[model samples]
Target: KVFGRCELAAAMKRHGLDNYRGYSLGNWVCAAKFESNFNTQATNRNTDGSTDYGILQINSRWWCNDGRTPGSRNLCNIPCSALLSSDITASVNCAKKIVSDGNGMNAWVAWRNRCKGTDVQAWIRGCRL
Candidate 1:
């Protein structure tokens, strides 16, 4: 399992998960909370057959690969399972590459749907920097 709240916040900050082009730690936290509740093992299949993997729910359709998942772009060139570990280096790296693509966090549906236009600070209410 991944951590929670301040722990996750600390992890994010430690790994430089803070500030994307313009997004903040709070925005990142909001996405992780809704995406997988910070659980790295989380995986869900989309109606279209693509699967989402790990804490950020990175999609199999365009990012990582599972040995059996077909037709994945595997843009990050890492296994989907790589995201399901205590160490978040791989996940964070891919997320960085993803955000760097200029899609921002909009690539995470959870963030766009639940975090947009809201007060993102509450997601890190008691968290330290």
Candidate 2:
């Protein structure tokens, strides 16, 4: 159960994200799985030393906040501290902003395209809300 009505409602309230006319929380849950495996503290250090952080993989230093230390090679964006501070919807909205541009999911068709196949149901099961 990725999202019960209450949890979906809370996410919507926090981020003002709409589920289109027909989509439901299940869809959002699947997206969450593909993005961050539902782990809010997830982070990845790339070969170039840039780091993707948080549930939505927001590069804290590049997009949201400044990079790591002065001499560090990693571009640590969206520190764990900020990730802890942000609610679920905030993280989702941040991702939506990146994928959908400023218009949000309106222009982000790749989310649906990339999340297809058997993994769809698995993703749904892995992350509901």
Candidate 3:
């Protein structure tokens, strides 16, 4: 399901990201596509059986603090369903936190730089702090 524009706007407001240029639902969607293909339920597996979850691909094993469920706590108080629950702003803010604080986007850019043909700036356009 595609995210709504209003939701994205709200999320930006909540996260203090409203000042960014080119910030929009489209930009959020593009960032998700470039990062994790909009997979709200996605998880990255570790050798120890730990995982990252949701659209932003947040590793629930580390960030979540709310007592919701086993994997829910790792999602930083926002449920994975929120990532796909038509709450675009919530998802965008969640992603922004990860990319900004967790250095997720920076890692992606570093990987892209190593690929030798990727457009790092284009992929992360309007994703600055």
Candidate 4:
């Protein structure tokens, strides 16, 4: 499922992503915009054969078990398919674990490039979050 900008922002906030690990809701909104365009089913294959899945691009190698990634840790202890669900609570929970594990929001390249140290409020200014 593809989400509208505000829709995604609201969902993230509801799932406890706002102000998570010093990253605001807008920062997450920006990451989603650049990483997956708010599409829950988005996936990107990596050179290592691991895949990034879902709106936040949770990775198979470290976060989820895809059954195809070599040396996958499955640190989140969830199937990669769970991240692709329209209800993003699973993805959100996994992301919390990822960031709390000392890998901050910069875990996503889009967040580093587009959201970090920038005025991220624009991503969710009118979203009523």
Identify the leading candidate in terms of lDDT: 4
Clashes of 1: 0
Write down the TM-score of every candidate: 0.93, 0.51, 0.47, 0.96
Regions of model 4 farther than 4 Å from truth: none
Q: In angstroms, how far off is 33's CA in candidate 1? A: 0.4
What TM-score should be assigned to candidate 1? 0.93
Report the error of model 2 at residue 12, Å.
Answer: 5.4
Q: Candidate 2 residues 27-117, lDDT tens each?
A: 5555555555556666676555555655555654444553552344322334434653436644654555565545443332434556533
Estimate, for each residue in 1-129, the C-alpha lDDT of model 4 and write its tens digit: 999999999999998899998888898899999989999999999888999999999999899999999877999999999999999999999989988887698788888987889999898877777
RMSD of 2: 6.5
TM match of model 2 to true structure: 0.51
Error of 1 at 18 (Å): 1.0
Point out the higher-scoring one by TM-score: 1 or 2. 1
The full ranking of all candidates by lDDT, starting with the best, is 4, 1, 2, 3
RMSD of each: 1.2, 6.5, 6.6, 0.9
Worst lDDT run of 10 residues, candidate 4, spans 98-107
- Which lDDT value does model 1 have at 2? 66
Q: What is the Cα-based TM-score of model 4?
A: 0.96
Candidate 3 global TM-score = 0.47
Per-residue lDDT over 1-129 for candidate 3, one digit per residue giving the tens place of the 0 to 100 score: 433334433454566644333343334434555445554554565454444555454554555433333553453466555555534566556655665664444434423344224442343345432
